[PDB]
Amino acid sequence: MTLETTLFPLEGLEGLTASYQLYAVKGLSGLDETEYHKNVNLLVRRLSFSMKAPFVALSRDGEQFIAVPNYVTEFPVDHRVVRAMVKLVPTGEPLNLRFDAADDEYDGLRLRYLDFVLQQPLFANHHLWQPGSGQPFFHKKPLKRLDDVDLYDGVSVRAAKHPEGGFGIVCDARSKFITHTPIGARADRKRLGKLINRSCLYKMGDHWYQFRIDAVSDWKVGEPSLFEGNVPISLAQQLVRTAGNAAPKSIIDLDPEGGALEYFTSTNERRMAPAELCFLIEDTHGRRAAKLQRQTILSPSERRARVNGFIRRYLSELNIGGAKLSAGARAHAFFTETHMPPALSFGNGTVLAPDTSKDRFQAMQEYSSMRRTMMLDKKVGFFHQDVFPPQTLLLPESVKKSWGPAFASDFVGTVQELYPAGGYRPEIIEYRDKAYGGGVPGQMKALLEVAERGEIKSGDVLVMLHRINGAPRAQDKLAAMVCNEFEKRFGKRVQVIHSDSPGRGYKRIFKNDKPTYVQQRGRGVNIKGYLKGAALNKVCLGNSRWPFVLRDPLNADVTIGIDVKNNMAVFTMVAEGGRIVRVQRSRSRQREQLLESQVTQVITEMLSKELPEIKKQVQRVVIHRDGRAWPAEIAGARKTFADMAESGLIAVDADVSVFEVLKSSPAPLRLFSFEEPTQENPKGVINPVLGSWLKLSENDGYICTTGAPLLLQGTADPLHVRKAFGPMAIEDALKDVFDLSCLTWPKPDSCMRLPLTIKLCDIALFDDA
């Protein structure tokens, strides 16, 4: 019940002052909406990098208004590219924002400035470095040596509004893996080729930063490759030129035969750097580094200790010109009531509700297990129990001629035991997976031709695919295309598994003087666990057979999730208690963004189909965006629902609100709860409990969709949700984000970080055109 944050008070904020000079933009009256605000942002990016100053945008009224700092002087005021031509007229009267006053809309301006000048003392600390601007600050000394790769520890620092008034600082520990020894001067033109688009840390003497390799230079470090005023200069002469004073040996005694890399500046010029001073960033999310990744998951006491360490060590004194700032040593703490999980409804009128008499921790663990065993118990079971429509199972020819039939037999029997009301009985079909190519084209040609033959009766298909490319950072093209084409050209709803995981669960045995396949539990997969999880996720949830739903209404009558990536948008809708769930894909113009009209279209169409089934009149609507919410998207959303209030489809006085769900937060905040100190836990720091929550503002909040009883390792990552519009109190939004995340349908006995709405986007949009 007692919680501590990673938000820290800022003392001495007075005197510190921010002076902007609002402008306004003329450009093109052609406010193409998605194309107007895209250009607003491009200029503020272009201007911030070029003039190295905190330019902000303030979109009130006409959405114009660029804030220029008052210490820059020769301001061009006109700016090319950007298609059309642009002019910035001032809006006069010079601003002088303050950190003691009260909530403005100029507080996005104070926050920009505050973040800009706080990274000035840290940037000039000889023992810290920063890969790039906005990123965390790392110790130059590795925390751990870890054999051929070094583990660096860092702490991110972000200005925030303080809930008890004023301004503070949110912080979080970070980790980074860098190879111990440099690329080297002894690395040839061909090996430096193999390294383009990798990233490396450049130890440019005392100045450390990170860049992305774009090219191998034609010139060695000692040959003339650039020139300062006509005179052709070598890169080695250039670095000696800009070394200062007691320059370290490494940057004034380079091997002249070593190679150089090339890379682009923030403002897009070309620059070189000697390979002798460059250390490859070990992309531990590119290559599977299981032993390494364990080192980056911190226990709550480890995580609190490193964040506070860094605050006490580097932030107790801060000289921003005149001002002398301090970060308080004690982070903001508070008493709160934690949200209890919601009552849920299963089969046979059975309800599951958290016991209020047990202590919270025991109550949460019993409830979360009960979600699984109630689902499995034949006398309670799924909330939605009917017979399945016809089902197809589509297998590679090479699998059907081997372990296929043993797998299918086990899989059906697993479905029948999980979901006995369904009578699962699929028709087993094959496609000629060895006939055309084994790459994405070829597999597709074999799959299509089976569909064109009409061999897929039934509208639901579970298709088993070969994994074309692995590495948990590529993208499953083949699975995406089979869903688009099987749904567009034919009317099919398709789920997907892969051939490798279940293959590893079968071995060939000789029985009754005949070869047959049977299970094995060697290593490669827990095959029994694989069948249960795939039966649930691919067949039951694939057929919209929800195993449990909310007993009691949320604050929103309907709530809608929206994500867009790779020119594929996904809308999802959750109404009644999860009793109504619709997931609808749709192609888009932009890669990650939606046209004002495409929003009004898809949503009116989805909601109108379901409104006859929603027996309470609709009067509170919530949209959950995955990422930033662009105002072309908010407009289409305000539009859609204004209409339906006139047509009488919903209540006349109904209202909408839009919220961003920032699964990767720009201000990562953590929460801690406390315990009896205990030898192994000297300070007694533990995870917060599952329902803990915190409001920093009327527009920013945090909710622990994961937490104490149900986390097996690490420290909980609270979920950041930000209001973008509407009459809905952020506390109310936080409460049903939490209720929506107790619908743990993919793994009932678990916590689940995202609410169901944007959780539905992830699995659906894993398949993007």
Place this chain on the structure above:
DNA sequence: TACTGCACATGACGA
């Protein structure tokens, strides 16, 4: 097959 925690990704530097 599925769950979390993790590093991967808007906006200042630096050959």
